Amino acid sequence: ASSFDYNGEKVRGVNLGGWLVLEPWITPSIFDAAGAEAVDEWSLTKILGKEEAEARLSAHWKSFVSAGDFQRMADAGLNHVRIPIGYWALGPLEGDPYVDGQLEYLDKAVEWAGAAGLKVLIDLHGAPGSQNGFDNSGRRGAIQWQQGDTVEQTLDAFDLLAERYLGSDTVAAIEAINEPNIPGGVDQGKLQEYYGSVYGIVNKYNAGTSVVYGDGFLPVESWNGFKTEGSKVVMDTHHYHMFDNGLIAMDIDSHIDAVCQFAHQHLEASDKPVIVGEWTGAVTDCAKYLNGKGNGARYDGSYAADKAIGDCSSLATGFVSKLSDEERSDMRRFIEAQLDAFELKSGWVFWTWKTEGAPGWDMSDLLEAGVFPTSPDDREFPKQCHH
Numbered sequence: 001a002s003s004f005d006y007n008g009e010k011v012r013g014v015n016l017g018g019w020l021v022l023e024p025w026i027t028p029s030i031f032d033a034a035g036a037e038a039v040d041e042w043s044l045t046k047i048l049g050k051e052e053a054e055a056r057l058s059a060h061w062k063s064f065v066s067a068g069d070f071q072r073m074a075d076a077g078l079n080h081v082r083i084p085i086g087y088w089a090l091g092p093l094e095g096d097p098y099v100d101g102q103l104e105y106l107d108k109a110v111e112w113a114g115a116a117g118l119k120v121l122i123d124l125h126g127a128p129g130s131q132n133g134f135d136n137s138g139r140r141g142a143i144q145w146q147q148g149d150t151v152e153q154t155l156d157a158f159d160l161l162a163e164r165y166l167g168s169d170t171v172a173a174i175e176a177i178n179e180p181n182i183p184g185g186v187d188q189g190k191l192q193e194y195y196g197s198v199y200g201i202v203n204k205y206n207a208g209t210s211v212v213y214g215d216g217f218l219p220v221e222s223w224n225g226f227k228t229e230g231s232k233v234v235m236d237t238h239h240y241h242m243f244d245n246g247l248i249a250m251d252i253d254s255h256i257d258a259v260c261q262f263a264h265q266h267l268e269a270s271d272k273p274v275i276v277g278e279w280t281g282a283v284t285d286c287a288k289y290l291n292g293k294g295n296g297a298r299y300d301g302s303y304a305a306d307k308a309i310g311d312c313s314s315l316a317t318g319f320v321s322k323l324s325d326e327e328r329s330d331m332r333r334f335i336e337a338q339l340d341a342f343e344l345k346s347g348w349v350f351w352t353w354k355t356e357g358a359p360g361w362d363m364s365d366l367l368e369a370g371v372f373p374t375s376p377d378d379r380e381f382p383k384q385c386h387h
């Protein structure tokens with residue numbers, strides 16, 4: 001029934017973060033070229049105006065990703081690419097600063113992914129009004145998704161996206177919405193209705209396509225009993241160690257233990273396939289603009305009055321060649337542990353393929369540096385998490 005057997009085959013993926021939905025920490029140069037107030041795609045496009053925005057963003061859409069990216073992904077042993085796209089690619093709302101033109105590039109991605117033997121997971125990453133208040137939704141600040149006609153507008157966009165892509169076997173799965181922020185104020189009951197509607201849309205166009213649901217930052221197993229359907233419905237949980245005070249304080253051994261505990265207590269408790277649809281090699285929040293442009297870092301005490309653990313100058317910018325052998329070794333230990341833990345359930349999708357230099361966050365960097373394994377058998381350290 002299913003284009004990809006999420007029940008019985010492991011996902012090994014990367015995200016194309018920052019490509020069709022721009023994010024300051026992923027491409028700081030583009031935001032900094034429009035000044036201090038350009039802190040998300042909304043403000044960036046608004047500052048530039050429609051003509052200049054289309055010029056600068058389209059330059060990036062074209063240059064950031066080629067067919068050779070996808071071939072390198074396949075060479076790294078991957079079988080999936082998760083591709084963020086904003087609602088505005090399917091038509092900016094009246095009054096939106098956003099420009100479109102992204103779909104021509106997503107069309108190319110589907111072609112290139114197919115040629116390389118990869119599946120694509122299309123991810124609706126930003127919804128009208130913002131589902132999370134994060135910069136990566138398009139507009140940081142408030143959560144106004146579920147107000148007014150925002151949800152209907154989201155479904156209108158989703159429908160067009162599904163219609164456009166679900167005729168291709170390359171597109172194995174589609175995600176309802178990236179990181180709906182339940183603790184931030186998204187209503188779960190209404191979210192579940194949106195999920196029900198998304199499932200109907202997918203089944204109008206191709207019942208063979210899997211539907212991906214984010215856990216909304218609730219424990220993934222809490223979603224037991226909702227749309228439990230084998231390979232058809234896949235939960236997406238995002239697992240990071242730098243956005244919580246407990247995890248960020250850990251040493252490498254403790255980080256690794258926490259990954260295994262997460263797999264055993266959460267991934268293995270879900271009644272559905274669960275991809276870890278975002279995770280990374282970094283263990284600090286030092287990357288420039290990671291908490292938002294104009295915000296600092298927990299790690300060095302510059303965010304939320306957290307107490308400094310260490311300095312961020314080494315890990316804020318640049319490429320892992322700048323680090324020591326031991327630092328790369330520890331980073332690889334943490335990556336191997338996640339690969340093995342997350343393959344206990346349904347697999348994994350690394351965040352992200354490519355940056356302007358954010359140590360531990362850039363798979364293309366880590367691969368070339370020998371930090372990222374290229375197969376399940378490619379292990380420099382003992383297996384850290386077991387059945």
Ligand SMILES: CC(C)CP(=O)(O)O
Pocket residue numbers: 134135136243290291292
């Ligand atoms: C804090 C985290 C969960 C959200 P962002 O910093 O990635 O936007």
Ligand code: NA
Pocket residue numbers: 281282283284315331359360
């Ligand atoms: Na790190």
